[PDB]
Amino acid sequence: IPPSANDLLLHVLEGVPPPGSRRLVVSGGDARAWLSNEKMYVRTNLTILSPGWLASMTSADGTHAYEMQKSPVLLVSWHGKVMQLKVEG
Amino acid sequence: IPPSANDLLLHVLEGVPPPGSRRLVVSGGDARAWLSNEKMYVRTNLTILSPGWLASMTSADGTHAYEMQKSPVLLVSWHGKVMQLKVEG
Amino acid sequence: RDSKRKIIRDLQKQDIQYVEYGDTRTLIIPTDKYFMFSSPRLNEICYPGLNNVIRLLNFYPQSTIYVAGFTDNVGSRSHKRKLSQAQAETMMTFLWANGIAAKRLKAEGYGDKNAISDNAIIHGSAQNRRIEIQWF
Amino acid sequence: FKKPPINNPSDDATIKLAEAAVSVSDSMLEMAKVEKVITPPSKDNTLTIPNAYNLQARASVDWSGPIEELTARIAKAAHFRFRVLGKSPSVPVLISISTKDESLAEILRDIDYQAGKKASIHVYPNSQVVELRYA
Amino acid sequence: KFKKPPINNPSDDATIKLAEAAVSVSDSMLEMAKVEKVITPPSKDNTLTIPNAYNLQARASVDWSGPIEELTARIAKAAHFRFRVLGKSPSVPVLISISTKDESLAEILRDIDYQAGKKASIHVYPNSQVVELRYAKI
Amino acid sequence: ALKETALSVGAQAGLAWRAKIIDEQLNKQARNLDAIYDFNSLVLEHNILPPVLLEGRNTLNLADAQSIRISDRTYKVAKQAHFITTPPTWRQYLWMDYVKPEAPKEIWCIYTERGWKNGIDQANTILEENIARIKEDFGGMILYRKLLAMNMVSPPYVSHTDLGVTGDGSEIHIDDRVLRITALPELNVNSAEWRAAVAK
Amino acid sequence: LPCRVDGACDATIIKMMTDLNKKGIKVASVGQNYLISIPASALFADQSPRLNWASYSLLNEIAAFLKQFRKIAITVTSYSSKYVSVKRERALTLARSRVVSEYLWSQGVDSRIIFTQGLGSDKPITSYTLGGDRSPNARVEITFRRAV
Amino acid sequence: LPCRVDGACDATIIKMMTDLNKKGIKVASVGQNYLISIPASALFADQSPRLNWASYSLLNEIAAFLKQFRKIAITVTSYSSKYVSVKRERALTLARSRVVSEYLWSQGVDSRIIFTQGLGSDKPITSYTLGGDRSPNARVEITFRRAV
Secondary structure (H helix, E strand, O other): OOOOOOOOOOOOOOOOOOOOOEEOOOOEEEEEEEEOOOOOEEEEEOOEEEOOOEEEOOOOOOOOOEEEEOOEEEEEOOOEEEEEEEHHH | OOOOOOOOOOOOOOOOOOOOOEEOOEEEEEEEEEEOOEEEEEEOEEEOOOEEEEEEEEEOOEEEEEEEEEEEEEEEEOOOOOOEEEEOO | OHHHHHHHHHHHHOOEEEEOOOOOEEEEEEEHHHHHOOOOEOOOOHHHHHHHHHHHHHHOOOOEEEEEEEEEOOOHHHHHHHHHHHHHHHHHHHHOOOOOOOOOOOOEEOOOOOOOOOOOOOHHHHHHEEEEEEEE | OOOOOOOOOEEHHHHHHHHHHHHHHHHHHHHHHHHHOOOHHHHHOOOOOOOOOOOOEEEEEEEOEEEEHHHHHHHOOOEEEEEEEEEOOOOOOOOEEEEEEEEEEHHHHHHHHHHOOOEEEEEEOOOOOOEOOOO | OOOOOOOOOOOOHHHHHHHHHHHHHHHHHHHHHHHHHHHOOOOOOOOOOOOOOOOOOOEEEEEEOOHHHHHHHHHHHHHEEEEEEOOOOOOOOOOOOOOOEEHHHHHHHHHHHHHHHOOEEEEEEEOOEEEEEEOOOO | OOOHHHHHHHHHHHHHHHHHHHHHHHHHOHOOOOOOOHHHOOOHOOOEOOOEEEEEEEEEEEEOOOOOOEEEEEEEEEEOOOEOOOOOOOHHOOOOOOOOOOOHHHHHHHHHHHHHHHHHHHHHHHHHHHHHHHHHHHHHHHHHHHHHHHEEOOOOOOEEEEOOOOOOOOEOOEEEEEEEEEOOOOOOHHHHOOOOOOOO | OOOOOOHHHHHHHHHHHHHHHHHHHHHEEEEOOEEEEHEEEEEEEEOOEOHHHOOOOOOOHHHHOOOOEOOOOEEEEEEEOOOOOOOHHHHHHHHHHHHHHHHHHHHHOOOOEEEEEEOOOOOOOOOOOOOOOOOOOEEEEEEEEEOO | OOOOOOOOOOHHHHHHHHHHHHHOEEEEEOOOEEEEEEOOOOOOOOOOOOOOOOOOHHHHHHHHHHHOOOEEEEEEEEOOOOOOHHHHHHHHHHHHHHHHHHHHOOOOOOEEEEEEEEEEEOOOOOOOOOOOOOOOOOOEEEEEEEOO
């Protein structure tokens, strides 16, 4: 039996970071990202296209929140546009 | 019972090198070569004539792949022409 | 200064090839510069080469005109046959709508199979993509 | 005077690259054409719009749970009697509707879709009853 | 003076070897399309579930690579059709990437319906004005 | 030797220059490469990335002086089929890594242009290995769909075992399906169940 | 470093807006929606789905104005005054919108969708019905929403 | 080191192409296919399978033109206008093509294979049949595809 999701994803489905994190600097898109223990969490409404996420949630207003490995670039879809996003860390 | 082929030859039937190789510098013909562990692998569509190959595969488009010992020259048939090919390593 | 030698010299400068052979004359037209890409829509920004080939074809007003479309190896075989047929057909109606009688013109499209260069190489397949105009 | 296209295939490698792209795109479309299972609309087996004037009320539902309670209070939203025929299993048939101005006939349509094989929806609007059926 | 006819722009070798990789991936993909379409005959189209209509013969030219819902909502909003979905959305997004030029919305939604293979399905009811997107039940 | 450190001065600058030039050359063809490497329309129906079946025809192995082994085809699966979340683009394969180095007479000039050409074709061989790798992966997934159409490989068998409302009073998960791949795709060695494609 | 401008500047937006309005191509802009209204005599000939060759300079400056924003769907629709029939009118205006969006899609716009349609004088802007394509009801107009 | 050129210059093949076209040897080049074309009076005597002694210098310069490409199969074929019979005509043109490929295979080419054949005016290139081997139908051609 797998785990259900991360339950930190309800925290990062809001804007509030996980306890004991480090914030990453999202440039080039409306996302936030934090780094708790070798995993980055993004809080987005862009959709994540390339770098692979390990878990995801989505709130009522279409904010998603993804748990993934530490990738320096995110490839997103904005509105059919395929954009990129730099983080630092 | 002998082994079937090398199973590295399906990788070198494409242009992708084996894991943990060293590239070789083929000169004077459209072949590529890697040196994996005292063994070179050429990827070509010429015909190998002199130096003796130990194993061979061939893809759909007449690409071949040869596993042989490390010879610095290769004799090829291009289109009935005997030609040579220098490698370095 | 407005003759046949001048218009084949500026056809060479507008990069349409022209070969005299006996009674046959053959124009070779690049589809990559004289057609919109993978479509039988004409590249009308390259109009003055097309004005030069209708100025060339006005000189020979009684010949049967074969026109023929050619692709390179890519795509399906039916796609090559239909797209080469379509490019030969719109070149045929360009000549018919710029003043050739409708029974001298004859359009045929071949899906890459005559192949004046090889198709295994980049500049050779670029030279394969052409329109042949044979007339007598 | 007009212009050429901006990122045109205007180059002897890129014409072969983008010709390969339009070739792999239409060959992708015909392999999608063969392994796409379709359904004919005469044999689709989903619910239609039952066109009752009580069923044309524009409702709003954000809910996710068992289909029996949503259909019971969507029935008394539509002033309909509600009948359940069949046995509700121990694992419940779960649905999820989150829309905020939508007609309750189409809400009934897509809970019939989200039921699928585990349940089904009938509406008899002359007797004004809506029946959730199990299997 | 001697001149072979196609004198294009100077290419570079990235586009050259990307091109001759792309032609091998193209004819192996049409080889796959050949064996798949001969082992199963496609018996039915999707024009019987997406028929043409007035204000569906308006044309569009689309490049798009995101999820299906914003694209189909924009197709239906310019088609003057009420857009509705059936099924809750899967948690992985069903992604399409429609890259085409100058065709009508009926065959655009047929290409959307084919590119969503066994994940979603476009139905159009042109007696009313409904474009409907259905996800799958898995 | 000063020519040699001039050559390695030119090497990393030519590699970073060729990496930048083919990076915007890759970015020019971004929709075309998205049309070419449509991995998204090659995934399976439960979002499974299909496996990479390499093919080698006409195989020989000379084992010694006395024995060879030939086979007419081999098919080998690498990179087995698995639950993908987001399908891979071309940019995980083909993107060359651009840094701009800030690390700086006559034989310096001519060996630094020889080192610049060495950095240019060194980056070209890195690119040649990259499109080789993505040609291997996408051709193996195309060949998976070909051999599944030919009934040479098994399709993957998922099992969605459903759970209803799950958890205690502090955590619920309402519709809690757990999906497994029980049977991985593998080549069937049962030879009589294959399908042989004609065309016309 | 991230980029400040998107290859575009507000001075060139207002310069192309006042120059297109000086040329008679009326650029209304209500909030975030934008509307470029072209009379059909400036693009096509009389009752024809064929551009004049001089009108491509107008479409070049229209596409250079359209490069300046970031948008999602450009819609472009055409209607001309009544000539022989409403079906002739809708086929003429559908071909007029599809040829002007074929050139705008051939040019650089960074839109994702272009919705091309034509109506058969179904939205006249004036009750005066003076002529064919000299009429101000005969127009092709380009509407979009400037995203962010 | 590897070699830059293969004993051949691009200036030398445009020089040999324009001097052979000045001499009346029609050298056309469509893509990678090349056809050089000698009339039969420039090599042979009239209705005769024998070269002149002066024509060997012409065969030396076409052998120097064929020494600059990398080719696989040179096909040399002959046809001349009809003399007493088509069987005598075909034996004449077969003997003419095997004579000129005997000299070209003796000289410097690097083709792997030379296909020699002769036809009995089965492809005329004009309807003007006024000459013997002064007719422009009467020719030998060397056709090949230059490899890579």
